[PDB]
Amino acid sequence: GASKLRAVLEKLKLSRDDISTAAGMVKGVVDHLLLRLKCDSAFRGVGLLNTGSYYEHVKISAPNEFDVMFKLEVPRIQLEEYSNTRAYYFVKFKNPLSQFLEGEILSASKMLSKFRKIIKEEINDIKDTDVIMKRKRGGSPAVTLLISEKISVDITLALESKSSWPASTQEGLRIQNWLSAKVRKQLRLKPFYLVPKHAKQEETWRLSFSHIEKEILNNHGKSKTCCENKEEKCCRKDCLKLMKYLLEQLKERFKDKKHLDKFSSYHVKTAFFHVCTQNPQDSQWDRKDLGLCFDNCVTYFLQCLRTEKLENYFIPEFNLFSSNLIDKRSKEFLTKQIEYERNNEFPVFDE
Ligand SMILES: [K+]
Ligand SMILES: [Zn+2]
């Protein structure tokens, strides 16, 4: 019940200082690397995009792991959808990237290879930081830093396009009844990002809207003053934290076979945004209703698992839970675990 969930939230707060201290160390190294790249390199136009769980104020664990995005301002990009994937594209131009062009198409593999080598090069001049390599993951994260051989920092390179968003997003970002049609128009005037990502041989890039995800989470109410005063304290962020923690704790129980390896915090975050669409009123997220609101989040996530459908919040035809991405057996296994936990008041949360 809600008392147990409040106790979980209190336990998560115990880690706040370790996470923010580690975030400061990451920022020091990231800033140093950025300055090396901007001064003189093939990536002079690089900039820091402050996106991800820490900047959304929902990173509640893993102080030795951070995800960082670098953006690269590029001239006007023309996109070509890869097959009917909706989220993966070839990048053409209508420039300082000609080196990575093959014909008209900007090569993600060439850009990624240059990026990794250049970062390796600059890191040799930076204190107690080394480049390590994790699983390629289609090209994003591009490269991993290890700081004082403790903190792993995944760095993603993203091209910034200031053009209007691709057609596949036309029916996405269904925030009109929650955050307003005015806000949806405002957000769609912002740039979008392209991250090098294999689509599952090809030089494809995947759309990224991490900056918009941050904006929503940090300005998340129907009321503009949601969470700015004691009368409008909602539980949206608490629910996302509890959903992330639920998944983390379930994965912890299968560290041997890693049966839940295909599931990510991004799945939980995406499902959470859909529940915000379904429950657009701040009165549907009253902090006094934490237990009901968390149940709303858990039951919607269960629905996604059972129906094998979790639409990307910005690209509705990109199904994160399609059997091409996550096998049916894994989704059924997670359904059984979450079903049991929900029916028993989340004993995974017991002390
Ligand atoms: K070094
Ligand atoms: Zn709020």
From Swiss-Prot:
<keyword id="KW-0945">Host-virus interaction</keyword>
<keyword id="KW-0013">ADP-ribosylation</keyword>
<feature type="binding site">
    <location>
        <position position="234"/>
    </location>
    <ligand>
        <name>Zn(2+)</name>
    </ligand>
</feature>
<feature type="modified residue" description="5-glutamyl glutamate">
    <location>
        <position position="149"/>
    </location>
</feature>
<feature type="modified residue" description="Phosphoserine">
    <location>
        <position position="265"/>
    </location>
</feature>
<dbReference type="GO" id="GO:0006974">
    <property type="term" value="P:DNA damage response"/>
</dbReference>
<keyword id="KW-0067">ATP-binding</keyword>
<dbReference type="GO" id="GO:0002753">
    <property type="term" value="P:cytoplasmic pattern recognition receptor signaling pathway"/>
</dbReference>
<feature type="cross-link" description="Glycyl lysine isopeptide (Lys-Gly) (interchain with G-Cter in SUMO)">
    <location>
        <position position="224"/>
    </location>
</feature>
<feature type="binding site">
    <location>
        <position position="67"/>
    </location>
    <ligand>
        <name>2',3'-cGAMP</name>
    </ligand>
</feature>
<feature type="short sequence motif" description="Nuclear export signal">
    <location>
        <begin position="9"/>
        <end position="14"/>
    </location>
</feature>
<feature type="modified residue" description="Phosphoserine">
    <location>
        <position position="264"/>
    </location>
</feature>
<dbReference type="GO" id="GO:0051607">
    <property type="term" value="P:defense response to virus"/>
</dbReference>
<dbReference type="GO" id="GO:0050863">
    <property type="term" value="P:regulation of T cell activation"/>
</dbReference>
<feature type="modified residue" description="Phosphoserine">
    <location>
        <position position="53"/>
    </location>
</feature>
<feature type="binding site">
    <location>
        <position position="154"/>
    </location>
    <ligand>
        <name>2',3'-cGAMP</name>
    </ligand>
</feature>
<dbReference type="GO" id="GO:0160049">
    <property type="term" value="P:negative regulation of cGAS/STING signaling pathway"/>
</dbReference>
<dbReference type="GO" id="GO:0005524">
    <property type="term" value="F:ATP binding"/>
</dbReference>
<feature type="lipid moiety-binding region" description="S-palmitoyl cysteine">
    <location>
        <position position="234"/>
    </location>
</feature>
<feature type="cross-link" description="Glycyl lysine isopeptide (Lys-Gly) (interchain with G-Cter in ubiquitin)">
    <location>
        <position position="258"/>
    </location>
</feature>
<dbReference type="GO" id="GO:0031491">
    <property type="term" value="F:nucleosome binding"/>
</dbReference>
<feature type="binding site">
    <location>
        <begin position="265"/>
        <end position="269"/>
    </location>
    <ligand>
        <name>ATP</name>
    </ligand>
</feature>
<keyword id="KW-0446">Lipid-binding</keyword>
<feature type="modified residue" description="N6-acetyllysine">
    <location>
        <position position="222"/>
    </location>
</feature>
<dbReference type="GO" id="GO:0071360">
    <property type="term" value="P:cellular response to exogenous dsRNA"/>
</dbReference>
<comment type="subunit">
    <text>(Microbial infection) Interacts with herpes virus 8/HHV-8 protein ORF52; this interaction inhibits cGAS enzymatic activity by preventing the formation of liquid-like droplets by CGAS.</text>
</comment>
<dbReference type="GO" id="GO:0005829">
    <property type="term" value="C:cytosol"/>
</dbReference>
<keyword id="KW-0460">Magnesium</keyword>
<dbReference type="GO" id="GO:0002637">
    <property type="term" value="P:regulation of immunoglobulin production"/>
</dbReference>
<feature type="cross-link" description="Glycyl lysine isopeptide (Lys-Gly) (interchain with G-Cter in ubiquitin); alternate">
    <location>
        <position position="309"/>
    </location>
</feature>
<dbReference type="GO" id="GO:0061501">
    <property type="term" value="F:2',3'-cyclic GMP-AMP synthase activity"/>
</dbReference>
<dbReference type="GO" id="GO:0019933">
    <property type="term" value="P:cAMP-mediated signaling"/>
</dbReference>
<feature type="cross-link" description="Glycyl lysine isopeptide (Lys-Gly) (interchain with G-Cter in ubiquitin)">
    <location>
        <position position="13"/>
    </location>
</feature>
<keyword id="KW-0234">DNA repair</keyword>
<protein>
    <recommendedName>
        <fullName>Cyclic GMP-AMP synthase</fullName>
        <ecNumber>2.7.7.86</ecNumber>
    </recommendedName>
</protein>
<feature type="cross-link" description="Glycyl lysine isopeptide (Lys-Gly) (interchain with G-Cter in SUMO); alternate">
    <location>
        <position position="214"/>
    </location>
</feature>
<dbReference type="GO" id="GO:0005654">
    <property type="term" value="C:nucleoplasm"/>
</dbReference>
<keyword id="KW-0488">Methylation</keyword>
<dbReference type="GO" id="GO:0140693">
    <property type="term" value="F:molecular condensate scaffold activity"/>
</dbReference>
<feature type="cross-link" description="Glycyl lysine isopeptide (Lys-Gly) (interchain with G-Cter in SUMO)">
    <location>
        <position position="71"/>
    </location>
</feature>
<keyword id="KW-1017">Isopeptide bond</keyword>
<feature type="binding site">
    <location>
        <position position="197"/>
    </location>
    <ligand>
        <name>2',3'-cGAMP</name>
    </ligand>
</feature>
